[PDB]
Design an enzyme around this catalytic site. Sequence first.
Site, short mmCIF file in Angstrom:
data_model
loop_
_atom_site.label_atom_id
_atom_site.label_comp_id
_atom_site.label_asym_id
_atom_site.label_seq_id
_atom_site.Cartn_x
_atom_site.Cartn_y
_atom_site.Cartn_z
N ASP A 188 -51.31 12.69 -2.26
CA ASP A 188 -50.03 11.96 -2.00
C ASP A 188 -48.85 12.92 -2.16
O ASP A 188 -47.85 12.82 -1.47
CB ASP A 188 -49.89 10.81 -2.99
CG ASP A 188 -49.45 9.54 -2.25
OD1 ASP A 188 -50.04 9.25 -1.23
OD2 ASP A 188 -48.53 8.90 -2.72
N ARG A 214 -43.66 12.79 -1.15
CA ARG A 214 -44.67 11.80 -1.61
C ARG A 214 -44.87 10.73 -0.53
O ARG A 214 -43.93 10.08 -0.11
CB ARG A 214 -44.19 11.13 -2.90
CG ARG A 214 -45.37 10.43 -3.58
CD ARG A 214 -44.94 9.94 -4.97
NE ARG A 214 -45.59 10.78 -6.01
CZ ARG A 214 -46.67 10.36 -6.60
NH1 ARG A 214 -46.58 9.59 -7.65
NH2 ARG A 214 -47.84 10.72 -6.15
N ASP A 243 -50.84 5.46 -2.26
CA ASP A 243 -51.19 5.83 -3.66
C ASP A 243 -52.64 6.32 -3.71
O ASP A 243 -53.53 5.72 -3.14
CB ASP A 243 -51.03 4.60 -4.56
CG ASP A 243 -49.72 4.71 -5.35
OD1 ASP A 243 -48.83 5.39 -4.88
OD2 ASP A 243 -49.64 4.12 -6.41
N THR A 244 -52.88 7.40 -4.40
CA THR A 244 -54.27 7.93 -4.49
C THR A 244 -54.99 7.30 -5.69
O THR A 244 -54.35 6.81 -6.60
CB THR A 244 -54.23 9.45 -4.66
OG1 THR A 244 -53.01 9.82 -5.27
CG2 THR A 244 -54.34 10.12 -3.29
N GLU A 270 -56.29 8.50 -8.21
CA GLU A 270 -56.39 9.50 -9.31
C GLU A 270 -57.41 10.57 -8.93
O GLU A 270 -58.58 10.29 -8.75
CB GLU A 270 -56.84 8.80 -10.59
CG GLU A 270 -56.10 9.41 -11.79
CD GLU A 270 -56.71 10.78 -12.11
OE1 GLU A 270 -56.58 11.67 -11.29
OE2 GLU A 270 -57.29 10.91 -13.18
N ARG A 289 -38.67 13.81 -4.84
CA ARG A 289 -39.85 13.64 -3.96
C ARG A 289 -39.39 13.13 -2.59
O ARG A 289 -38.46 12.36 -2.49
CB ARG A 289 -40.80 12.62 -4.59
CG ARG A 289 -40.09 11.27 -4.72
CD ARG A 289 -40.62 10.53 -5.95
NE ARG A 289 -40.59 9.06 -5.70
CZ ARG A 289 -41.25 8.25 -6.49
NH1 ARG A 289 -41.97 8.73 -7.47
NH2 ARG A 289 -41.18 6.96 -6.30
#
EC number: 3.1.31.1
Length: 149
Positions: A21, A35, A40-41, A43, A87
């Site tokens: 991301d 970003r 959203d990744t 993790e 970002r």
Amino acid sequence: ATSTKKLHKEPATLIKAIDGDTVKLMYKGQPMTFRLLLVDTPETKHPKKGVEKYGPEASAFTKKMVENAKKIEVEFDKGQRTDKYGRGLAYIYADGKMVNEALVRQGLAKVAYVYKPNNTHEQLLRKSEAQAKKEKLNIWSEDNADSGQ
């Protein structure tokens, strides 16, 4: 008076992505972070951690698609353009393809919390997010076979 104005995309020079991301691109010839917006990744970390699921898959598809895509375009929304950490809040377009839409439809991420007024490509991410949860792709792949009341 309030209806519609007009938007426009601009070409950039990707520099080097760090996560699935967080990617550093070259805007107007400058090193800045970017970003993915509404993304959203799950993790991620180093691939030498005994991983074997979605480790080197989402982050690898982001830096890989941005490395091959000889034409990386960017499109900022109408809301703010940068956040507090500097970002870049926008959507990338590798080879004319919303990189974010590809990481969301391939169950390689999740629709980050949406916060108005940034809500242009939201409904679109909603459809790709549902189909992904229905195919059990990568993240949704762990859903296993659970159905039938």
